Nucleic acid binder design. Structure first.
Ligand SMILES: NC[C@@H]1O[C@H](O[C@H]2[C@@H](O)[C@H](O[C@@H]3[C@@H](O)[C@H](N)C[C@H](N)[C@H]3O[C@H]3O[C@H](CO)[C@@H](O)[C@H](O)[C@H]3N)O[C@@H]2CO)[C@H](N)[C@@H](O)[C@@H]1O
Ligand SMILES: [K+]
Ligand SMILES: [K+]
Ligand SMILES: [K+]
Ligand SMILES: [K+]
Ligand SMILES: [K+]
Ligand SMILES: [K+]
Ligand SMILES: [K+]
Ligand SMILES: [K+]
Ligand SMILES: [Mg+2]
Ligand SMILES: [Mg+2]
Ligand SMILES: [Mg+2]
Ligand SMILES: [Mg+2]
Ligand SMILES: [Mg+2]
Ligand SMILES: [Mg+2]
Ligand SMILES: [Mg+2]
Ligand SMILES: [Mg+2]
Ligand SMILES: [Mg+2]
Ligand SMILES: [Mg+2]
Ligand SMILES: [Mg+2]
Ligand SMILES: [Mg+2]
Ligand SMILES: [Mg+2]
Ligand SMILES: [Mg+2]
Ligand SMILES: [Mg+2]
Ligand SMILES: [Mg+2]
Ligand SMILES: [Mg+2]
Ligand SMILES: [Mg+2]
Ligand SMILES: [Mg+2]
Ligand SMILES: [Mg+2]
Ligand SMILES: [Mg+2]
Ligand SMILES: [Mg+2]
Ligand SMILES: [Mg+2]
Ligand SMILES: [Mg+2]
Ligand SMILES: [Mg+2]
Ligand SMILES: [Mg+2]
Ligand SMILES: [Mg+2]
Ligand SMILES: [Mg+2]
Ligand SMILES: [Mg+2]
Ligand SMILES: [Mg+2]
Ligand code: NA
Ligand code: NA
Ligand code: NA
Ligand SMILES: [Zn+2]
Lengths: 50, 121, 160, 152, 81
RNA sequence: AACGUGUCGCGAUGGAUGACUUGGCUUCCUAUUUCGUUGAAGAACGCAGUAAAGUGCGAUAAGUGGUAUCAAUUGCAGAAUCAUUC
RNA sequence: GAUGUGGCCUGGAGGUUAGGACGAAGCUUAUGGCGUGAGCCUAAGAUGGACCGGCCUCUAGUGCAGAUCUUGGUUGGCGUAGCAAAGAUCUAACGGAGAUAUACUCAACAUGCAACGUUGGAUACUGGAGCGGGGAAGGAUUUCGUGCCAACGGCACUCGUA
RNA sequence: AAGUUUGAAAAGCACUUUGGAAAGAGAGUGAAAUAGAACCUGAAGUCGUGACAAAGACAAUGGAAGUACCUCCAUUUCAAC
């Protein structure tokens, strides 16, 4: 499993660098399921991406 | 179609680059002794729905109806002449028309015109 | 005339550790820098290229031509020479073989074959027929596929 | 790549081979030859101990200016190595041979290797770049490996 | 220095595509094709390169109209009665 | 001992040789046989149910029309007619 | 250096005489025999699959060991020289065929090594004249997502501008 | 540069088994698969393998004579011959 797409999308949405993007080490399955900016924003709201 | 000449190269090129309408004449088969006596014609170009008997090769003696004159592989397909594949399917086996004898002619108005014009009597 | 020489080839010189042969110019292709213009070089010109003004034909003295024809005719009247040449004339009645002039009136090949059988030239004819075979070598790829022996010659008084 | 030798008893033998392995021919040559007369289980144990670096593969022919080691003494040599890429390839081949013996109904515990042949396969071409704008070959040397074993 | 380093100094293009022949031989600054001499009315043709002539000669392309007119000439400009 | 050497049997690598030849080369001949502003040669871009190249073609685009021919094309698919012309 | 040779050999032509699916050409040889020799002939093929031999004459792009000869392939060197500028990586979990992969004996060490992609930690680097963010020239789909590891990224890849 | 020149016909190897895959081992087709796929024939050179021959260091090869061992070669002989 590679979360590169979600990390890239999170960086763009949060307007910060990759070092500032935190992708929950657990819930990798739920993060992997997010393939759109709308889904990534929901992950940010739920706290899986900080 | 006057393919044979003094040049083997030219004759072979004309044969193997012959158009489809010339390939039809090249893919002719002799008529049966019964049909030869009735029409006074020695041979006819094979066409679909003709009845033929194989005279040369492995399938010699087999009767069947012509299902295709492929004309690109210089073969005719006979419904009763076939074999089995590895997976059990049945595939037709191509036969050169000069190895078969036409036992029944699929008759059409232009086919009858050809038979009348080739009548040697 | 241009075969093997239609290239802008030049020698590289002696400074480079290669043979002093003209070489194909340019780069990017397999032939780049390959030997050229030589009879020893692949793709080069053949040694002494053939010309159409080679002496194909020959003059022969007219009397010598007539002498040769006369000698050939005289040899044809010797059955030992005819047999030595390879003809089967074992059953023919006489040499020279002279037949009547009525054969010029034949219209069917069947009658001609009957005449040949009657005068016993069919043995030589069958010799040619059994000798028909595919020519050995490249000549069969040329227009000389089939070879056979020479049979009897039937000489007419005219073109009829 | 047909088998150069035939087993004494065909019904009591198992065969296996691989073509264009993409392993170094010389290293694989040394690795496969050492198991030529060994029982199948002993060959598998040796390969595991080579991977553990407690035993080595003796380099008898293609050993020009390679290092020396004490683990080569058991083979009567002083030069040996641990070619893991060749070793794991050979262990896979032994597994296929054991599977063939099992399929034919033979006992792998009683199978003795009888034939081992390594051949130079067709070479794959790459290029390397040298000083003064020179291009020079950078070749890969794959190998053909064939073997069979018989019940003892 | 001349060689490798100077290879990186080569910027821009001397030649671009030619409208008439499409050989990338159109000199941008001089506004003329090195291959076919466009926009001069006539093309380049030199007997010291017959190979160049025969690359560009008639019959190397489609002969779109020449095929039609040759058939008409062979048929003596036949027309319906 | 081991490397190494030599021979034979069998394999690998490598594509010579023979057979094959719809190509080339060369020599003859025939003729209501010689392009274009009525836009040529050449260049470009497109066109197939499936289609990169090549070939053919030009938004009527692997072709429309007419004559002859007389049951196909064909890798798959599609297809009124199984046929005096339509 | 000259000359001679019912002297040898090769492609083709005119003649003649034969062979071949019960195996032609070609190819292979501790297959022998013959010839001072060039070479010829037979035997075997657990070789090949369709042409071809002898003799007289004619004819020519007619005989190779080497021209720093031409083209193609191979080869010892050789698993050798090396793959050392730009400092540096470690750890767990997950993912993956890429494992914790075992005849007998035997508790695990001494018999499956090495190397990976992602995420979270840790350590450090670039230090705004940046391995930062945008443009021209040049390139022209390298952009993005999914799949995928044959070949390619001179080690590796589950990664990639493949 | 490059003949796709497999075969008479794709009949182009179903199915089983091992392998992640490639492929291997079986099984089939075919007269032939060492005709398995850009596949007729498959030389030389080089290499692997099994069997055997031996061999110090005279670099190896070569010449002439024997001998030891081997020989799917040839020829002769087998009875008062
Ligand atoms: N035996 C020693 C060597 O034999 C070689 O030649 C051998 C081979 O070239 C030759 O060919 C053999 C053939 O005899 C034998 N009866 C059948 C075998 N197929 C052939 O072998 C051939 O085909 C096989 C594959 O089929 C390939 O692996 C092999 O490389 C190839 N040479 O057999 C010869 C043996 O007598 C060399 N002439 C020579 O270097 C040396 O004397
Ligand atoms: K020279
Ligand atoms: K050359
Ligand atoms: K102009
Ligand atoms: K020129
Ligand atoms: K010499
Ligand atoms: K080497
Ligand atoms: K973009
Ligand atoms: K690679
Ligand atoms: Mg030439
Ligand atoms: Mg020949
Ligand atoms: Mg060293
Ligand atoms: Mg060393
Ligand atoms: Mg370099
Ligand atoms: Mg450079
Ligand atoms: Mg300068
Ligand atoms: Mg400048
Ligand atoms: Mg300028
Ligand atoms: Mg300007
Ligand atoms: Mg296209
Ligand atoms: Mg329109
Ligand atoms: Mg019609
Ligand atoms: Mg010649
Ligand atoms: Mg030998
Ligand atoms: Mg010569
Ligand atoms: Mg030579
Ligand atoms: Mg080193
Ligand atoms: Mg190093
Ligand atoms: Mg360094
Ligand atoms: Mg260095
Ligand atoms: Mg273990
Ligand atoms: Mg491990
Ligand atoms: Mg710093
Ligand atoms: Mg910057
Ligand atoms: Mg990308
Ligand atoms: Mg690599
Ligand atoms: Mg064979
Ligand atoms: Mg001994
Ligand atoms: Mg001796
Ligand atoms: Na026939
Ligand atoms: Na060889
Ligand atoms: Na050998
Ligand atoms: Zn131009």
């Amino acid at each position: 499993v590679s979360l590169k797409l979600q990390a890239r999308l999170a960086s763009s949405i949060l307007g910060c660098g990759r070092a500032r993007v935190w992708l929950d080490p657990n819930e990798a399955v739920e993060i992997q399921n997010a393939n759109s900016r709308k889904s990534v924003r929901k992950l940010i709201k739920d706290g899986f991406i900080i | 179609a006057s393919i044979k000449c003094g040049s083997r190269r030219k004759a072979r090129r004309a044969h193997f680059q012959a158009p489809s309408h010339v390939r039809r004449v090249l893919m002719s088969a002799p008529l049966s002794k019964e049909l030869r006596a009735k029409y006074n014609v020695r041979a006819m170009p094979v066409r679909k729905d003709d009845e033929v008997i194989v005279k040369r090769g492995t399938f010699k003696g087999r009767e069947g109806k012509v299902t295709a004159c492929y004309r690109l592989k210089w073969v005719i397909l006979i419904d009763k002449v076939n074999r089995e594949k590895a997976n059990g399917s049945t595939v037709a086996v191509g036969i050169h028309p000069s190895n078969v004898e036409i036992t029944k002619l699929k008759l059409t108005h232009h086919r009858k015109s050809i038979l009348e014009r080739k009548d040697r009597s | 005339r241009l075969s093997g020489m239609n290239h802008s080839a030049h020698s590289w010189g002696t400074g480079r550790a290669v043979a002093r042969i003209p070489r194909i110019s340019g780069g990017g292709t397999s032939t780049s820098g390959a030997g050229a213009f030589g009879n020893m070089c692949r793709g080069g010109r053949m040694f002494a290229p053939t010309k159409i003004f080679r002496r194909w034909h020959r003059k022969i003295n007219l009397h010598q031509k007539r002498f040769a024809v006369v000698s050939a005719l005289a040899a044809s009247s010797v059955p030992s020479l005819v047999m030595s040449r390879g003809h089967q004339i074992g059953n023919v009645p006489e040499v020279p073989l002279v037949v009547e002039d009525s054969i010029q009136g034949y219209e069917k090949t069947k009658e001609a074959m009957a005449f040949l059988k009657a005068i016993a030239a069919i043995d030589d004819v069958n010799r040619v027929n059994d000798s028909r075979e595919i020519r050995a070598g490249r000549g069969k790829m040329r227009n000389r596929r089939y070879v056979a022996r020479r049979g009897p010659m039937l000489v007419m008084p005219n073109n009829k | 790549t047909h088998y150069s030798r035939k087993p004494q008893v065909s019904s009591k033998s198992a065969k296996a081979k691989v073509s264009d392995l993409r392993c170094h021919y010389k290293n694989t040559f040394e690795t496969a030859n050492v198991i030529n007369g060994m029982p199948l289980r002993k060959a598998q144990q040796l390969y595991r101990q080579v991977l553990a670096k407690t035993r080595c593969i003796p380099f008898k022919r293609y050993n020009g200016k390679i290092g020396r080691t004490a683990q080569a003494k058991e083979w009567g040599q002083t030069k040996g190595r641990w070619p893991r890429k060749s070793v794991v390839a050979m262990m896979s081949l032994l597994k296929n041979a054991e599977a063939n013996a099992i399929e034919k109904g033979l006992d792998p515990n009683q199978m003795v290797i009888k034939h081992v042949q390594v051949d130079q396969a067709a070479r794959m071409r790459r290029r390397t770049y040298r000083a003064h704008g020179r291009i020079t070959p950078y070749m890969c040397s794959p190998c053909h490996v064939q073997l069979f074993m018989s019940e003892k | 220095t001349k060689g490798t380093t100077s290879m990186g100094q080569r910027h821009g293009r001397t030649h671009i595509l030619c409208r008439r022949c499409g050989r990338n031989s159109y000199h941008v600054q001089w506004e003329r094709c090195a291959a076919c001499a466009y926009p001069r009315a006539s093309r380049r043709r030199y007997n010291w390169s017959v190979k160049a002539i025969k690359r560009r000669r008639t019959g190397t392309g489609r002969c779109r109209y020449l095929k039609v007119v040759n058939r008409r000439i062979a048929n003596h400009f036949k027309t319906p009665k």
